[PDB]
Amino acid sequence: RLDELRRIVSQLDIPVRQVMIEARIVEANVGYDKSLGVRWGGAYHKGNW
């Protein structure tokens, strides 16, 4: 039993394997906004849009 337990000990005393985990977050924002306000105002003859 001593010897068998020794073998189990050999199996158990194994280095735990570390891994480097690299998770990367990428955010991309593209924004194009165009606004045109066209104005025609005359109070001389009261025509104004």
């Binding site: 003859h45 009261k46 025509g47 104004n48 849009w49």
Partner: protein, 48 residues
């Protein structure tokens, strides 16, 4: 928005205005979240 005024004052005061507004708006929103999940397991994606 739009106005047209016609006015008489000397003989009679008659002010006649036509006020018109026309608005058209089209908005499209397309949002797509993609999640990779193991079989029979719950996974979540959250943005907000």
């Amino acid at each position: 928005s739009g106005i047209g005024i016609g006015f008489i004052t000397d003989n009679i005061i008659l002010d006649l205005q036509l006020s018109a507004m026309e608005k058209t708006g089209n908005g499209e929103i397309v949002s797509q979240p993609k999640v990779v999940t193991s079989d029979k397991e719950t996974a979540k994606i959250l943005k907000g």
